Each structure stands twice: as structure tokens, then as C-alpha cells.
């Protein structure tokens, strides 16, 4: 009887794999388009963030002059 | 403390050209005896004096200078 409940629990109750693959098509339509953006982010980020951190580095170095007058 | 103005109060107590001054000074010397021990309370020497203290104040005088630099950059 539990098996019957297990029958209820079986994934893809809609039993429409042909539609499921289409769902996966929509998933590509989402994910794959997301990928270029999400990858573009780091390029839009760290590429400048390094240099800006270096700009912090300059002031950090010049602090030492005051530290040792 | 007491070593300071105690001298100030003992200082005016001298009176009469006559050798009666001791009658006053006996009151003084006992305090001075206490001073000999009060001085023991002040048996310390960190900084020398001037000009080393002045060098300290000047040391801050340079050390306070940056405060009107990078902090200004913060603004």
C-alpha cells in the first residue's frame, strides 16, 4: 500500500517528457542568457577594483611618510 | 603637594632679629622631618624635566599635524 503512495510520489506525474524537454528549452532560454551577464560582471568589477585598490595602496604607502617623519 | 606650599608657609614665619626664631623653626623642622619622609612618597623620576618634556609636547605638535591631512582627505 505504501508502494501506492510511492506511486503518487514518482517525479513527472504529468508524464509528459516531450513537454519537459521544452521546459528545459525555456531553462536554456533563461540560464544560457544569464551566463554571459554573470560572467560579464566580474569583468565589470575586479578589472577596475584591482586598480582602485591600488589607488588605496598609494595613500596607504604615503601614510607611512607621516608614520616616519 | 605639601612639600610645595609648606615651604611657602614656613617662609614667612621668620621674625625678630633676636634668636627667638628657633622657637618658630622648631615647629618648622618637624614638618621638614615629615618632609624628609614626604619626599620618600615622591621617590620617582620618569621624565627628567625640561627640555625633554618640551620635546614631548613638540613631538605631539608634529604628531598632531597629520590629523589635518588625511582626515581632510576623508572629507
Swiss-Prot record, chain A:
GO terms for biological process: positive regulation of transcription initiation by RNA polymerase II; regulation of transcription by RNA polymerase II. It comes from the Eukaryota. It is found in: Nucleus. One of its GO terms (molecular function) is transcription coactivator activity. Keywords: Activator, Coiled coil, Nucleus, Transcription, Transcription regulation. Residues 18-59 form a coiled coil. This is Mediator of RNA polymerase II transcription subunit 21. The lineage of its organism: Eukaryota, Fungi, Dikarya, Ascomycota, Taphrinomycotina. The chain holds residues 70 to 138 of 138 of the full protein.
From Swiss-Prot, chain B:
Coiled coil: none annotated. This is Uncharacterized protein C24C9.04. Residues 56-66 have a biased composition (Basic and acidic residues). GO terms for molecular function: transcription coactivator activity. Residues 55-75 are annotated as: Disordered. GO terms for biological process: positive regulation of transcription initiation by RNA polymerase II. One of its GO terms (cellular component) is mediator complex.
Amino acid at each position: 500500500m505504501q508502494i501506492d503512495t510511492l506511486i503518487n510520489q514518482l517525479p513527472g506525474i504529468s508524464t509528459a517528457p516531450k513537454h519537459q524537454l521544452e521546459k528545459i528549452k525555456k531553462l536554456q532560454n533563461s540560464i544560457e542568457e544569464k551566463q554571459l551577464e554573470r560572467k560579464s560582471l566580474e569583468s565589470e568589477n575586479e578589472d577596475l577594483k584591482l586598480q582602485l585598490a591600488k589607488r588605496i595602496e598609494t595613500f596607504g604607502r604615503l601614510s607611512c611618510v607621516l608614520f616616519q617623519p | 603637594t605639601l612639600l610645595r606650599q609648606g615651604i611657602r608657609q614656613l617662609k614667612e614665619k621668620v621674625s625678630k632679629m633676636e634668636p627667638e626664631e628657633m622657637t618658630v623653626k622648631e615647629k618648622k623642622s618637624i614638618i621638614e622631618i615629615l618632609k624628609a619622609r614626604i619626599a620618600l612618597k615622591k621617590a620617582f623620576l620618569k621624565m627628567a624635566l625640561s627640555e625633554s618634556n618640551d620635546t614631548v609636547v613638540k613631538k605631539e605638535d608634529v604628531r598632531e599635524s597629520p590629523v589635518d591631512t588625511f582626515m581632510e582627505n576623508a572629507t
